Structures are given as structure tokens and as C-alpha cells.
RNA sequence: CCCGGCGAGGGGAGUGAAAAAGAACCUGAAACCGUGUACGUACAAGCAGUGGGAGCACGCUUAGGCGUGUGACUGCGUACC
RNA sequence: GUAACGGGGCUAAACCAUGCACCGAAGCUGCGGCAGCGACGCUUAUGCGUUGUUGGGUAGGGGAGCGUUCUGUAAGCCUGCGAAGGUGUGCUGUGAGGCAUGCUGGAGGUAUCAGAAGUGCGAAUGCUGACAUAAGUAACGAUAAAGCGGGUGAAAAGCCC
């Protein structure tokens, strides 16, 4: 459409405040290594749990 | 204990040990204010008068500085006409101590 | 030296009006020439 | 000198039990306004609400007087279906019977927010099943 | 401004400004609307009122003690040097000298000197003459500016 | 003791970096370096060198130890704007307005 | 002779926005609504110079009006009684003894109803 | 000397009277967006102001009821040209 | 949507017959401050003492003062022994304004009084700049699309093989 007034600069930070992004609730290592870990997924050399996946 | 005075046109409710602030006074600093003009003392008890500046009663204050005050500035307007005015007055006062109200 | 120390007779100088200065001065917007017609407006018009 | 003034740490309440059998709606209705504004009191202030802490006994019972009640019915439009909408005056005495009491002392109080914190110190509950035993509530005639 | 009798219109009624000539005042620069013309403020000057505000300056400057009247006051030639020592010997700084008789050797003196100045009683200046701390004279230039001031 | 890096001119919008930069605010340096390792998007790349090179004088120079290292500021602001004619419909040419970020991360012991 | 035009200003400027302290958004920053805010600021005051002690005297009418109906008579036929009884200007702002200390008030309002007629 | 592509940009260290003169270098407002801190915002309501006001931080208030800033809350109340 | 007492509430807290009270404005009045001018006294070129009705106010008229830009006393006198300008605060006046000062600032400044004026912006749906704003909304250019492996490269879903 269009507007009435000029908005305020508090309206752009509560607009902004729940699309905001959130906490990762901390990190993971190896059970294996001294590697430090990507949560829930696997590193390049393979270690989650250990053994030995994708080498590349 | 509290009591009721006139200070001129403007009456004034105070206690004992109270600084109270008042429209001028002639009386400078070095010397004593009194009030026989004291119309009741509220006393300890509820108090039966009627004829006041209540002969049995006094209220001894002293003067504890004569000065002027702060500048208020007053602003007249009204919209659309283009009236728009200001005017200044500072206003004369005394402070008092006051020292008497019997129990 | 003694130059600088002159002074007009009691009001001799007059000063005389500016115009349009100010909001809160009671003079200035239609300037000492009231609301519309020929003579608010610059001088046009009417032949002397 | 200046004028004192209430504060909200200042204010006293004190705890009133209303007997509403005797009684009718409005006189009940604004003495009890008058006593939950501190106008019952002495205020002497323009923002404090004071008032008393106020538990109604009953009011489960409380007449009307003569025939303006059967055309008091409540009135409200919330957003739906042609027609006025209504509720009889015997529901609000019969099911939740509170409710007669707190909007009739409701419009006595001033604005918005301030009739919002004059209106929060009543109480009537179902009726005579109070709960304000321990505060010991000081029995009122009207 | 010269260059163009453009209008930058495309009408008005346009949600902007009636936007006339490309050379109006308010055209952000290039002209003002009252800038500055040729002044010249000088009057007529009304001669039997000038020669009495003399006749007044003139008789303050005897009034206030200012008028010295050195007799016959001059320079051997047209130096500063010997000015200036003429006037630390006179005990005086800062004097408006008044020369009656335009001689070169005193009208080319007092350049050198930073508050010491020289004048004609020939049309006395008025501005000059109620300034400087003394007026110096010469008994030539009194009778000369009093035969100016009839 | 304190080091700022700033990175002056840096090719972002600053909404997107502050998107950023608020996530890894007041986490101390290491653990903030990690959350910032591990998210790929490009705004954060650009934010690490900052991040980095503030850890980094640290490290060296005028500072001492990192272990107590703590990200005391982090915040950005607005570089200078460069305005371009974006074309479009009905051959319209309004400005679009090509910001950067002037992206201020300071850390201290304190 | 060119002048600045402004120089001035500045002085009148930064009065208007320290007056428009405290005040919110562009009221504080922005002068246009600065200068707005100052004007209805000061109008609203004068009105409220002399609409304070109307207000006031509500408050000390009610409370004299409490302590006095506990005392058993209503406030408008105590003050004819007291008005019909012997001299005493009185006033309504008087009662610091009706929030606080008040075993007191009574004597004046027990005259009062009695004088009355 | 640190981070970095070999980049961009800042910093430390050093230079000068001064870089609170750092190269777009003169000192530097105001819009502008963001930080740091204080106090505040979840019986919560409209020109956002006015009048009344809990509180708290800071200020040894010679502690002598104050100064400084903000303010729950609320009587009253319709911008300027 | 009560919404034909302003509303709650009232079957007397109503209404009618008689009357008294109270509350209720910057009115009426006194205090404290103050404008101009009438009257009388001193007694004037200027004023000051007592007293007095007065003083809501636009258009508009008239009197009076201020800073800004520049001259003139200013060829003097003050200045890195800390000048303009920026800024926070206090003091002060009837208001405009004046003054003092911490922080900034690294060269300029200044009355009394007269005089000249391009002389105070916030508006002209005024012109320009910096840059806000709805907004992180909308935009991904004939879907002559792409897949996955290796590589340059600090880094590849768009490059190269």
C-alpha cells in the first residue's frame, strides 16, 4: 500500500527479535580422537565412533 | 506538634523544628520572628477555640536567610493567530526556623 | 584618542521596522500587511 | 510549604465482611464502591488507590427492585450473527454469582488502569463459602 | 546569470515545486536574490553646519588643553628620522600634525612613524581632529582653517 | 590488556553481520571461534578475519596470555554507502544503495 | 556585507533541545519537533499553574469529610455550625490529623453540630 | 611485529609538539546506525506532554531530608505552520 | 453494542410544595513579585516617596533592545604564559540575550558608543548534500537448463579440466 508516518527505530529491532538466530547448546569431541567433532555428523577423517569412514 | 499562622494573605500550617519558606519579610537574619496571629495549636489533643490569634499561644521562629528565588518564566500561546508570548518573574521569599508550638 | 564617543539627539534616530523576523516577535508572517488581497501580495496592480 | 500526599506503602486496607442478605443491588453496590475507592476514607491523594480489602458473603441472593430486570440483560456484540446478544439477569445471580456484584460497582470507578486496581481488591465467591477466615474480617450491616 | 532563459517546468500540479526559471534565486547556487550593487553613500554635506561642528571640535581642542601651538614647526628636509627626534625632545607620541603651508619637508615626514600622522588645514579633516592626543599646530594653519571656518 | 581489529570496507550489509556478531557476543574467544568455524555462510567468513585478528595481536605484541581471553566488544557499522541505478519496469532508473561495513571486534582479558 | 545567518541560531537551538531533555524520540533529537514540544510543554504547565489546586482541593474536602462523618455529622452542616459558631477562619487544607495521629479533629466538628440551627 | 591471497582493513611497536595532526591527514556539529553503562518496560491502554509520585545508581548531601539522572505508577489532558 | 440522565446505581437516592446548607472559576479578596501612566509631595536635565483605576488579546500600528556579517576608537591593548570554533554544565536577565567554566581547540580576539547590511529558517507539495524510511519487505533478466570427479585458488553451486 503505502503508510500514515515515519517508523521508529525501536518498531525495526522488535520486528527483528524473533528471527534472530539461536544457541548451539555447546559442542562435541571424539570419543576416539583429540580431533574435535562436528555434533551428529562425521569429520574428514572419520571419527564419531571410531573405525575408519570416507577418506577423502 | 502542629499549628496554623497567618503570614499575610496566604495562611500557613507548620510544626516544630520545621524550615518553612514564606512570601518577603522586612526582618533579616540576625533577628527573631514571632506570631501571636497563631488562630489554633492542633496540640496533642483536639483543640475546642473559637476566638483565634489565641491569646495563651505563641509560634518563635527566626529568619535563616532572606532571598530571591529561581526564575519561572510564564508562556502565553494560543494557535493559528500567531500569539505567542513569554514573560519572566523570579519572586522574593524568607526562609524560617521555627523553634515554639508548646506541648 | 577621543573618536567613537558621538550620539544622535533624544530620538532622532528612530531604527525603523525589518519585518519578517521571528515567530514569537508578534511581527512576521504577512509582514505588517494583513491577510490576502492586492496589498499582502508584492506590489503589482493599481496605476498611481 | 507543601501538602502531604498517600504512597503506596502507606496504605492501610483493612478487611470487611459484607452480609448481602438484607440487602438490594445498588445500595450495597455504591456504599461498597465508595469504601473500594478509599472515599470511605480519608485518600488525601489524586493516584493512590487505597480502599478496604473486600470480601462480599453472598450476593447469590440479591434482588434488583421492581420490573427494570427483566429488560437488564447484559448487552454485548462480540463479533457475530445479526441481532443484539443477551444474558438474563438470572444467570449472573444463578451461575457465577459473583459477577452481578463486580459489574454493578465496575462503571463507578474512573478510566481505565486505576478502576483496573480499585476493581481487583473485591471478592464475593459462590456465596456464603468464604475463605477469608484467617485475616478475622470485620462484620458490616448496610 | 546569463546562459540560459530555461524553465524547468513539465508543468505544475506534479507533486513538486512550481519550478518557473532555471535561474531563480532559490536554484541552489550560481545568484542570490539581493546580492550586492555599486554603493556610493556620500551626501550633499550642508556648509554652514559642517563649519560650526568644526567651530566646536576647535574650541574643545583648546578646552581639553590638546592644542599645543608649537611655533612654527617643521623638518630641515624630508625625513622621519629628524621628526622623530623632534618629538622625543618635545616629550610627545602619537600627535596629529597640522602643516598651514604644504611644505614637502614636513608633509613627507611621519611615514616611518607607526601612530604619528600629517594633515592640511586645507578642508581639516573632522574624523581625524577629534582623534590623536594632541593637535600640533602651526600659527600659519590657525590663521588658514579659521579663514576656511567663516 | 586490549586489541581491536577492525575491518573497514568490508563487502556486507550491516543487519547481516550484527546477525552474526550478536550470536558470538560476550561467549569468550575460543568457543565463539568455534560456533564461527562451523557455521559455512559467507557473512561469518568475512567476520572470522576480524575475529582472528583481534584473537591474534593478542597473542603477541603488547598482550600477554590468552586463556583468560574475553570478547569485551563486538559490534558493526555503517561504512560509506556507494549509490548505483538499478534497472527496471518501464524503464525506470531509481538508486539502489551498495553499503559496507565498518566491523569492529574488540577483545581484552577483562 | 554577507552575513552567516545562523550563529545565532545555534544558542536558541541547543536551549530548545536541553529543555527537551527527558522527553521522547524526535521530541529530543530533531528540533522541528523539539520546538512543537516546548510550546504545548508550556501551555499545558500554565493551565496546570493554576488547575493543581483545583484538583487538590477535592482531595481536602474528602478527607476532612471521612474524619467527620466517623464524628457523626456530614460535612456541609458541620461547616454551617462551625460558620454560626464564634469567629475562626478554619481551613480546608488543615487536616494532617485525618490520615495520621487522628484521635484528634473531633472538638472543632463537636462544636460545629452543636451551634448549628 | 600480529591476522591475510600474494589481498583489503585495523591494531601493537616506533616517529612528532601534536597522529584525541595517520595520509580521504585542517578542528568538527546535526541527521544516521550501532556499543557500554545506569534506571525502567510481562493489571499491561490515546499527540507521549503536564501536574502528583514508590524506588534505585551515583554524589563521605559537615547525613541534616539535599544534588545529579532515570522512574513503577497514576489525577489531568486532542500536534506546529 | 446499553448508547433519548454522560455513565454506574436509584421503584426513592424519583418527581411535586416550601426552604436551608454546602461545594463551585485566573471572578470577588489578601499576600509576594511586576508593567505603564493619572493624582499629590519633594522637586528634576535625569528622579524618587506616598497613592490610584489599570495590565486576556490577533490583524495592524507605534516605541525600545539584541546577536550575526563588516567599518570606525583598533597602527593601540590581550594571546601558545592557551585565540575563534565544537560541546556538557552552572550562574544571571523581562525576553531576545549576557557571563563564568571542565572537556575539546592549536591561532586568533575584544568592549563602551556611532554607522553600513546579502542580518536569525521550519515549512514555499522551494533548490543540493549526507543519509534515513516502509525492509531485510521486493529482486534472481526468455528454466541457449545440468550432473558428479579432479584442479587453479586463501576460498567453488556459477570459473578451469
Redesign the pocket.
Known sequence: A??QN????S???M??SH?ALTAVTSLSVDKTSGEKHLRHHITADGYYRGRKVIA? | MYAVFQ????QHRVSEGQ?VRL??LDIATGETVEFAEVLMIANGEEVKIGVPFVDGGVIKAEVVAHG?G??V?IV??????????????????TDVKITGISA | ????????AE?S??????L?????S??????????KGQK?RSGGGVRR | M?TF?A???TVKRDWYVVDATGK????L???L?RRLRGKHKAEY?????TGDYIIVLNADKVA?????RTD?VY???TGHI????QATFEEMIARRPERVIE??????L????????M??KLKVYAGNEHNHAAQQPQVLDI | VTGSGKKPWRQ??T?????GSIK?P????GG?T????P?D?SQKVNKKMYRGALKSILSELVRQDRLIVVEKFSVEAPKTKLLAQKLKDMALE?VLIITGELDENLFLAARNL??V?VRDATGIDP?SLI?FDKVVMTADAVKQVEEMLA | ME????????RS????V?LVA?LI??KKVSQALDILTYTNKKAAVLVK??L???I??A????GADIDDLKV???????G??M?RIM?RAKGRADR??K?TS?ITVVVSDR | ???????????????I??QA?????????????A???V?????????????????F??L??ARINAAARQNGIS???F??GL?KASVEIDR?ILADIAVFDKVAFTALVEKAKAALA
Not at chain 6, 550489509?13 to 547481516?16: E, T
Not at chain 7, 554577507?2 to 536558541?12: D, L, P, Q
Not at chain 7, 531533555?21 to 519537533?33: F, N, Q
Open positions: 503505502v503508510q515515519k517508523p521508529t527505530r518498531k525495526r529491532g520486528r527483528r528471527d577423502k | 503570614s499575610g494573605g496566604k524550615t512570601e518577603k530571591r529561581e526564575k518564566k502565553k500561546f494560543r494557535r493559528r493567530k500567531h500569539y505567542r508570548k513569554q514573560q519572566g518573574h523570579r519572586q522574593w521569599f | 584618542m577621543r573618536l567613537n564617543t558621538l550620539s544622535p530620538g534616530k528612530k531604527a525603523g521596522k525589518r519578517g523576523r521571528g515567530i514569537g508578534g511581527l512576521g508572517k504577512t509582514g505588517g500587511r494583513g491577510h499582502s | 507543601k500526599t504512597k503506596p506503602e438490594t443491588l445498588g445500595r453496590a455504591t456504599e464502591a491523594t489524586p493516584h493512590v488507590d434488583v427492585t421492581g420490573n427494570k437488564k448487552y454485548h456484540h445479526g441481532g443484539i446478544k459489574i454493578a460497582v465496575k462503571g463507578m474512573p478510566k481505565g488502569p486505576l478502576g483496573r486496581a476493581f481487583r | 505544475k500540479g507533486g513538486r515545486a512550481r519550478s531563480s532559490i536554484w541552489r547556487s542570490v539581493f546580492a550586492a550593487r554603493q553613500h602619537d607607526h601612530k600622522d574624523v582623534a | 586489541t581491536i581489529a577492525k575491518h573497514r570496507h568490508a550489509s550491516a543487519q547481516k550484527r550478536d557476543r560476550g578475519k576480524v582472528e585478528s583481534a591474534a595481536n597473542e603477541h605484541n603488547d569485551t566488544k563486538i559490534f558493526v557499522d555503517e560509506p554507502s549509490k534497472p539502489i544503495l553499503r565498518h | 556585507a554577507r552575513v552567516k545567518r545562523g550563529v545565532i541560531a545555534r544558542a536558541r537551538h541547543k536551549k533541545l536541553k531533555k527527558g522527553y521522547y524520540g524526535a521530541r529530543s533529537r530533531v528540533y522541528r519537533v520546538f512543537q514540544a510550546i504545548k510543554a508550556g501551555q499545558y504547565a500554565y493551565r496546570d499553574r493554576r488547575q493543581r489546586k483545583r484538583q482541593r477535592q481536602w474536602i460535612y456541609s452542616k461547616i454551617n460558620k480546608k
